[PDB]
Symmetry: C2
Subunit: 336 residues, 2 copies
């Protein structure tokens, strides 16, 4: 269509700032109670349990809790069908299930097993009366409302925001707490960032790397999923820590790079790496670290990936339509 | 410099070094027996609260096997501190008493060294699975497990990756005191020899003109899929991407059209909805779907124990991908993007 604003993906992504504001207001005391309980009985480590977009949120959760609380974060394996020669030793661990609908039988079985093993199960979940919420020791509703687009947007940003409020309150980080009050306005600014250069440059694309590292890796993972689902583009997320492998093998004219960088110039590789990509004739866009894509000013560095994703949703919505796809309908059913 | 021929798959360093893998595993198990018994007894006497792995490249794929191996066999949660998924700035994590396993062929990577120093300073027990025994990584470690793979001159790692999987398996067998797994390890070198003879020429020939591909694995097989995808990228200039078979509704199915190639690695003992359930939709969408394991159309060697199956799949895959690289005009022995013949 000729009006990018007319998609549900656009309307729902635009809601994210209001979603985050009301989520933090509604969940404040519940999060404080959970945070106090974790300080009183510190878990030995954390486990995230999630699929799809929610697992890309778990990637961000890992970075947040490892860097801010100093706790190791592992991933559960809900739908892998492992047979345990030994029960998994989860006693006292914090077991974080992230799920939009909270109904996946695999997630439920994994959460039940974690509880039986003595873990504390918390659910970051949008559907508050879901089977997962009923199971959890503590429920953190995402408060994202209904998503009618098949493309997840505000629900993913809400998952990141809930992890951030958990980290802020658990840590008692007064600086991050103050930045949470500023985060909705920053998301509103991020929604206005002009990423038309990458929309225009990818109309004819057939391959892409989305690079990220550390704080922004989960955002790169989600961006690549969005390119696959809405644009029928083989975008692949890749850690810039491993740029000497896949990206150095394949980046070329006709195989471009979108990089999410932190202000310390990490997330795209070194200057020499980017220069090699450019010398090959590859298009390279970078959001962050003075890159050629404009980004909103983050009120706290840990907020930055939410802003990056908020900006990217507008660019990818526009790109889907330019490529002849309706981002509100499933792949293979959405060519216009 | 080594000289090869595009018309002779047996002429590459990748072929010669992958062919060594069985000999490597046999001698590694013999040379490391006493060290492994000592380490395993010490871990039983002081059980760690959990495990953390740390690795780069193909070693990270081996660490992913280690996750599912130790979670299912020892019941220990395994997390990653690999540079791929970790912070730029090595910092203290709450690791007191945890087993911190670093896997590295050369043992020199500065950020692996920093992460291991951080783990030791935080009270972790650092063990290094390393091919270079006098490397900085080995010197830091509390226990060194040499891979005994010898010199690997191909840019494409083969025997060092298989040796890393094997070392994890011997550790798990000795630590768990699993007599059936111990006995199976005696048969593993010969099973690798059988795997090296499996005929995958059909998928080699089928992918000569491919541009994009998904490699699928699950649990114990996920690291194998990741290793295969990396080899496709580097040796063949093919945009292959690895996915967990549990995630196909979040990415891979979106791109699959008629003829889109999918290579699925299956375990021999899958229960419930597994690889065949996922391959079913791929075939309903007309993808070109190959499967190794579970009665699929790419033959695999009989596994002496299900935990061995991913090693046998990769051993076979290495022959197929070496041949595919040559058919596509590339020397798998030379660096990525610089290896067109």
């Amino acid at each position: 269509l000729s009006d990018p604003t007319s998609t549900l993906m656009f309307a729902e992504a635009a809601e994210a700032a209001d979603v985050v504001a009301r989520q933090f207001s509604r969940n404040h005391a519940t999060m404080e109670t959970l945070a106090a309980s974790l300080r009183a009985a510190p878990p030995p480590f954390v486990v995230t349990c999630a699929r799809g977009s929610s697992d890309h949120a778990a990637t961000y959760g890992k970075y947040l809790l490892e860097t801010q609380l100093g706790l190791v974060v592992a991933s559960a394996s809900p739908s892998v069908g492992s047979v345990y020669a030994a029960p998994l030793q989860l006693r006292g661990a914090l077991f974080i299930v992230i799920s939009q609908s909270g109904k996946s039988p695999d997630l439920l079985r994994n959460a039940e097993a974690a509880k039986a093993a003595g873990a504390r199960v918390i659910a970051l979940v949008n559907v508050e009366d879901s089977p997962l919420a009923q199971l959890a020791d503590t429920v953190i509703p995402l408060h994202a409302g209904a998503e009618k687009s098949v493309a997840a947007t505000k629900s993913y940003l809400a998952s990141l925001a809930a992890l951030l409020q958990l980290a802020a309150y658990w840590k008692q980080d007064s600086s991050l707490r103050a930045a949470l009050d500023l985060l909705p306005d920053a998301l509103r600014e991020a929604w206005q960032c002009d990423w038309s250069a990458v929309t225009e440059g990818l109309v004819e694309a057939t391959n892409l790397f989305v690079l990220g590292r550390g704080l922004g890796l989960g955002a790169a993972q989600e961006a690549a999923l969005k390119f696959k689902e809405t644009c029928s583009l083989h975008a692949e997320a890749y850690s810039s820590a491993e740029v000497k492998h896949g990206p150095m093998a394949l980046v070329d004219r006709g195989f471009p790079v979108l990089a999410f960088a932190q202000p310390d110039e990490t997330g795209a590789g070194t200057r020499a790496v980017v220069e090699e990509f450019t010398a090959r004739g590859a298009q390279v866009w970078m959001a962050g670290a003075g890159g050629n894509l404009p980004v909103a000013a983050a009120p706290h560095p840990l907020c930055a990936p939410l802003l990056t994703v908020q900006s990217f949703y507008r660019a990818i919505n526009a790109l889907a339509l330019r490529r002849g796809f309706n981002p509100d309908l499933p792949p293979h059913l959405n060519k216009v």
